[PDB]
Amino acid sequence: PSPDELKPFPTVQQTIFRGHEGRVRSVAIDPTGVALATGGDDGTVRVWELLTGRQVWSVKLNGDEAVNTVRWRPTKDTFILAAAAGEDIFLMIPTHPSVTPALDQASRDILNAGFPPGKWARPGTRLEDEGVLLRITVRSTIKAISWHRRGDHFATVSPSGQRSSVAIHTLSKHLTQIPFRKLNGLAQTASFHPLRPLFFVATQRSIRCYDLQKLELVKIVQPGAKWISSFDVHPGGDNLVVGSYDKRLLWHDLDLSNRPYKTMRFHTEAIRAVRFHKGGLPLFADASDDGSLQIFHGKVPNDQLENPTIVPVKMLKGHKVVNKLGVLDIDWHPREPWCVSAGADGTARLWM
Amino acid sequence: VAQVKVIFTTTEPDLELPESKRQLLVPADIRRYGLSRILNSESMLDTGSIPFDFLINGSFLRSSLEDYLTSNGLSLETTLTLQYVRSLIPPVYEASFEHDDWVSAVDVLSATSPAGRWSSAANSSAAVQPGQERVLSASYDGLLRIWNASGSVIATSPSGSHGGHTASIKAAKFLTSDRLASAGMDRTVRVWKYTESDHFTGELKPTLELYGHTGSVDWLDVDGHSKHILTASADGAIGFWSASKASAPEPDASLLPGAHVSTAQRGPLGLWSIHTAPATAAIFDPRDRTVAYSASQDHTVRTLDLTTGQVVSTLTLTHPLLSLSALTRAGTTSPLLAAGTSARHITMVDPRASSATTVMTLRGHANKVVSLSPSPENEYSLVSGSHDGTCRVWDLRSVRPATKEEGSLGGVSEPVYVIERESWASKGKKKRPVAGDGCKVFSVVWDKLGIFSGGEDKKVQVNRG
Ligand SMILES: [Cl-]
Ligand code: NA
Structure with a gap:
């Protein structure tokens, strides 16, 4: 299979998002696919009109803390954005053309419904005025945020957390639990399952697959990487892609084996992020400190007996390498073969 | 030899x-x-x-x-x-109208423009005198501005504190010499009365605030004869509005500012959620004003019956569409539509066909094609405006077969002229900006007066022979 026969996939840089001072750490396209959210070294969260690059809203969460990650509540009936800076998770309703009085009301309701593992509090007058309604405080700086698909639970991971490293938060109950205190090493990042009550936790050298309703552990995964940077779960639920600082990209077929079904090395520097397209397109991408994104075709067949078809289709260059850092995060549009990237160069970029 | x-x-x-x-x-x-x-x-x-x-x-x-x-x-x-x-x-470079912020929309009032002709009815709208053409600009700063051709601002709309838009404007048109419509990020369409005093002084006063959309209102088309407006919104809906107080119905109260869940506030004649992704364009059929066409990021061009709201026909193209324009051809009641895509080409379609080719592609832009305007001089040319920073002029009389690189299906037409962004061209650099950095074109209109184009470089640019 040649890249010609594998269209569509993004090939060119089409919009740049300028405004952050210093690095852009995180990117997240909203559930409806019209807005981008970014988090920065400058401690701002910014929301943008996706196609034009217009900044439409921003807020400074904390002057002294970098926003490490931004992730939307994955439900279209609200407009809720989660952002981590240092020790806190902030839940907010950005000011945006889609936020009608009704949509605003709905969103406020979801957040206020709840009214030390996690300390749930209102964030104070200045932040309340700008549309930030909750501040949740944990023990150790968050480096990752992952929502459950129904929007009532979100998980946060804190590498130096030691033993409150992984927290799971129930939005409706304003309640932070820290199960899974059992664990092998240092936690890097985590993720819920798209179709089942499973939960994945990535340590430095393995990915442990767990069960939520029952209790604890159904599977280990062994990428065989010296240090895992990131992973993402295929929408089908049966496959994983894993990135590493070791410059290797792994595809795991969870059924077939617990070690990589395929190994890809294309990057001359660390991989920082990976991401499956979630809307049905057979695409995924990774992002490296060499300043490039590699795009792959990744097709999971209907027939179980046959194996996934994995083919690289494009290398996306355009980000500037700044003090040996390149691309720090990536997201896909929910429906179209478009991706956005966060750069150390202070920009986010849209590719189509 | x-x-x-x-x-x-x-x-x-x-x-x-x-x-x-x-x-x-x-x-x-x-x-x-x-x-x-x-x-x-x-x-x-x-x-x-x-x-x-x-x-x-x-x-x-x-x-x-x-x-x-x-x-x-x-x-x-x-x-x-x-x-x-x-x-x-x-059409060579003539002038620039400097703005503080991004220009989202441009329109032209001349004796031969659509609003001029609708004014020539002289039915409460005065005819446009030669030499007294006006250029409308809309800005991401939330204000409308009216310019004479020599580039002086004659009037500026009120701010959000005084009845104006309360967020960035995305689209705007003249209905007649004394009536305008605009729309944007506040989910409203505003209808304005425009009056001018000593040829260098003017006033824009809001007469209607129109509510209905539940997302950004990104495109509008007008009919100055019947006083109607069509909108396309990010909410995926097509809106159909009266621009007159005598015909505009009451609004959905839940959408109003201050709503718990002095200009007249009104609703739409019709509001149809027909697209599964943002709606990006909506235009009247030039020959039959009871018919509209819409385009959307969902890859479709739909034909609407304005008397009923029914989608009469759906064409599914291969890419998300960001713009739509009708060409008017002698001897034919059915237009030819130009559809600008997110995939950098423009597709020509007859809206009365099956989706599968039942085909011509305009190739040359390096980025999204978001604005289109037919030539006022003939029926085989048009100008497109793109996030690559250029406007391109096309001649549809010229078509070569497609290469395999271009999918090897259909005819391909290439531009006959490229209008560069003067703000970039005057730098004397060979390197064009990547990804429209600082120079995206957001709106272009082709009048007898000239080609006017506005965008991210914060100018309305004027090009003409
Ligand atoms: Cl901006
Ligand atoms: Na140019």
Whole structure:
């Protein structure tokens, strides 16, 4: 299979998002696919009109803390954005053309419904005025945020957390639990399952697959990487892609084996992020400190007996390498073969 | 010296050659220029100064005749039929109207513009006097501005504190010489009365605030005769509005500012959620005002019956569409639509066809195509505005087969002229900006007065012969 026969996939840089001072750490396209959210070294969260690059809203969460990650509540009936800076998770309703009085009301309701593992509090007058309604405080700086698909639970991971490293938060109950205190090493990042009550936790050298309703552990995964940077779960639920600082990209077929079904090395520097397209397109991408994104075709067949078809289709260059850092995060549009990237160069970029 | 057999032919009424003059031997290495000089000469058309282009098997000659024969593998004794046409006068840079912020929309009031003609009815709207044309700009700063042609601001709309838009404007048009409509990020369409006093002083006063959309209102088309408006919104809906207080119905109260869940606040005549992704364009059929066409990021062009809201027809194209324009053709009630895509090309479609080709593609832009305007002079040309920072002029009389790189399906037409962003061109750099950095075009309109284009460089740019 040649890249010609594998269209569509993004090939060119089409919009740049300028405004952050210093690095852009995180990117997240909203559930409806019209807005981008970014988090920065400058401690701002910014929301943008996706196609034009217009900044439409921003807020400074904390002057002294970098926003490490931004992730939307994955439900279209609200407009809720989660952002981590240092020790806190902030839940907010950005000011945006889609936020009608009704949509605003709905969103406020979801957040206020709840009214030390996690300390749930209102964030104070200045932040309340700008549309930030909750501040949740944990023990150790968050480096990752992952929502459950129904929007009532979100998980946060804190590498130096030691033993409150992984927290799971129930939005409706304003309640932070820290199960899974059992664990092998240092936690890097985590993720819920798209179709089942499973939960994945990535340590430095393995990915442990767990069960939520029952209790604890159904599977280990062994990428065989010296240090895992990131992973993402295929929408089908049966496959994983894993990135590493070791410059290797792994595809795991969870059924077939617990070690990589395929190994890809294309990057001359660390991989920082990976991401499956979630809307049905057979695409995924990774992002490296060499300043490039590699795009792959990744097709999971209907027939179980046959194996996934994995083919690289494009290398996306355009980000500037700044003090040996390149691309720090990536997201896909929910429906179209478009991706956005966060750069150390202070920009986010849209590719189509 | 090598010769080539040439037969001249034309569709220009005033420029027919006598029969004995039509077949001719010319030097094999002659190009468009030399062929043009021959036609203009005294022994031929004797027109002197008319630049011609030449159609051969449906596409413009862009090489020597020897090379055309080579590239198409034809015999040296092949007789070529050259259909000569008048070529476009180049629209060169004339002026810039400086703004503080991004320009999202431009429109032109002239005696020959749609709003001028709707005013020529003189039915409560005064006719546009020659020399007193006006240019409308809308800005991401939330304000409308009216300019004379010499580039002075005559009027600025009120701010959000005084009845104006409360967020960035995305779209705006004249309905007549004294009525305008605009729409944007506050989910409203505003209808304005415009009055002018001493030719350098003016006032814009809001007469309606129109509510209905539940997302950004990104595009609008108007009919100044019936006083109607069409909108396309990010909410995926097409809105159909009266622009007159006498006909605008009451609004959905839950959408109003201050709603718990002095300009008249009204709702739509109709509001139809027909798209599964953002709706990006909505236009009246130029020949039948009870019919509309919409386009959307969901890849479709839909045909609407405005009396009922019914989607009469759905075409599914291969890419998300960001813009739509109707070309008006003599002898035909059904327009030809130009659809600008997120995939950098423009697709030509007849909205009364099955999706599967039942095909012509305009290729050349390097980024999203978000604005389109038909030539006021004829029916085979138009100008497109793109996030690559350019406006491109197209001539649909010229079409070559598609290459395999272009999918090998359909005909391909290339631009006859590129209008660069003067703010970038005057830098004297060869490197064009990547990803429209600082220079995206958001809106272009082609009037007899000229081609006007606004965007991220915060200028309305004026180009004309
Ligand atoms: Cl901006
Ligand atoms: Na340019």
